[PDB]
Curated annotation (Swiss-Prot):
Residues 68-131, 158-212 form the Tudor domain. Widely expressed. High expression in testis. Part of a complex containing at least CDYL, REST, WIZ, SETDB1, EHMT1 and EHMT2. Forms a complex with ATRX, TRIM28 and ZNF274. Probably part of a corepressor complex containing ZNF304, TRIM28, SETDB1 and DNMT1. Interacts with TRIM28/TIF1B. Interacts with ATF7IP and ATF7IP2; the interaction with ATF7IP protects SETDB1 from proteasomal degradation and is required to stimulate histone methyltransferase activity and facilitate the conversion of dimethylated to trimethylated H3 'Lys-9'. Interacts with CBX1 and CBX5. Interacts with DNMT3A and DNMT3B. Interacts with SUMO2. Interacts with MPHOSPH8. It is found in: Nucleus; Cytoplasm; Chromosome. Belongs to the class V-like SAM-binding methyltransferase superfamily. Histone-lysine methyltransferase family. Suvar3-9 subfamily. The pre-SET, SET and post-SET domains are all required for methyltransferase activity. The 347-amino-acid insertion in the SET domain has no effect on the catalytic activity. Isoform 2 lacks all domains required for histone methyltransferase activity. It comes from the Eukaryota. Histone methyltransferase that specifically trimethylates 'Lys-9' of histone H3. H3 'Lys-9' trimethylation represents a specific tag for epigenetic transcriptional repression by recruiting HP1 (CBX1, CBX3 and/or CBX5) proteins to methylated histones. Mainly functions in euchromatin regions, thereby playing a central role in the silencing of euchromatic genes. H3 'Lys-9' trimethylation is coordinated with DNA methylation. Required for HUSH-mediated heterochromatin formation and gene silencing. Highly up-regulated in Huntington disease patients, suggesting that participates in the altered chromatin modulation and transcription dysfunction observed in Huntington disease. Its down-regulation has salubrious effects on patients, suggesting that it may be a promising treatment in Huntington disease patients. Degraded by the proteasome, shielded by interaction with ATF7IP. The conjugated-Ub is protected from deubiquitination by the SET domain. This is Histone-lysine N-methyltransferase SETDB1. The gene is SETDB1.
């Protein structure tokens, strides 16, 4: 069937859609198609390109209320790489508290982690019941399942600025230095190339966690 309304969705609404690049982009919902219990959502992107998407591959063009975000919520979040802004899918790992300066911790589908504000989040429209089940990277998927279902039990390493450890990157270990701690993240400086990364303190990419 061709629908105009489906739950809280309405044809003609502004929406975010996931492209083949894995980045998300503004568009308009132009059709809703059902095949039995299955539902697909046709999006016309602002560049006039069209794609037929599953409901976990569209997100609302508004920010979720705080009381609708939980550990395990499926979101699109802003990631600023340099002066470029991308919208990328992830999982809420932490909700605002004193220790994180009232921010949301996001674990992105590509393994990166960041603290963001509510204004940097968009809810995915039709997430899977087990929200991690559409994470393509199996390693990341398994990590998320374990994290979300064990929460609030979260093994983490205790580090401070100046400590020297090895940190994993693309399957090898690198000499590194702890630059900064911010809540559940540590900023690691890779000594070989002097590039840095915020890494979750429970990541086995950190030597002490790997060795624990
Ligand atoms: C460190 C500063 C510094 O290095 N800053 C910095 C700026 C931008 C960076 N961008 C990226 N991008 C990678 C892709 C991200 C995709 C995110 N998704 C869309 C959600 N990565 C940066 N760093 C990652 C770590 C690289 C380590 C390389 C290791 N090497 C030995 C091979 C990144 C960093 C502090 N200064 C030096 C004082």
């Amino acid at each position: 069937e061709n629908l105009y309304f489906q739950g809280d969705l309405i044809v003609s609404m502004r929406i975010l859609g996931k492209k083949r690049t894995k980045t998300w982009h503004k568009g308009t919902l132009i059709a809703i198609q059902t095949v039995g219990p299955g539902k697909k959502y046709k999006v016309k992107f602002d560049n006039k390109g069209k794609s037929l998407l599953s409901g976990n591959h569209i997100a609302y063009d508004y920010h979720p209320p705080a009381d609708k975000l939980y550990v395990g919520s499926r979101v699109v979040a802003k990631y600023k790489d340099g002066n470029q802004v991308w919208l990328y899918a992830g999982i809420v790992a932490e909700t605002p508290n004193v220790k994180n300066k009232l921010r949301f911790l996001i674990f992105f589908d590509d393994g990166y982690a960041s603290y963001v504000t509510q204004s940097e989040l968009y809810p995915i429209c039709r997430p899977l019941k087990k929200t991690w089940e559409d994470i393509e990277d199996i390693s990341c998927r398994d990590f998320i399942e374990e994290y979300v279902t064990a929460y609030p039990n979260r093994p983490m390493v205790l580090l401070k600025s100046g400590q020297l450890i090895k940190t994993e990157w693309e399957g090898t270990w690198w000499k590194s230095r702890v630059e900064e701690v911010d809540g559940s993240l540590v900023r690691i400086l890779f000594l070989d190339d002097k590039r840095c990364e915020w890494i979750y303190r429970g990541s086995t990419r950190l030597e002490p966690m790997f060795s624990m």
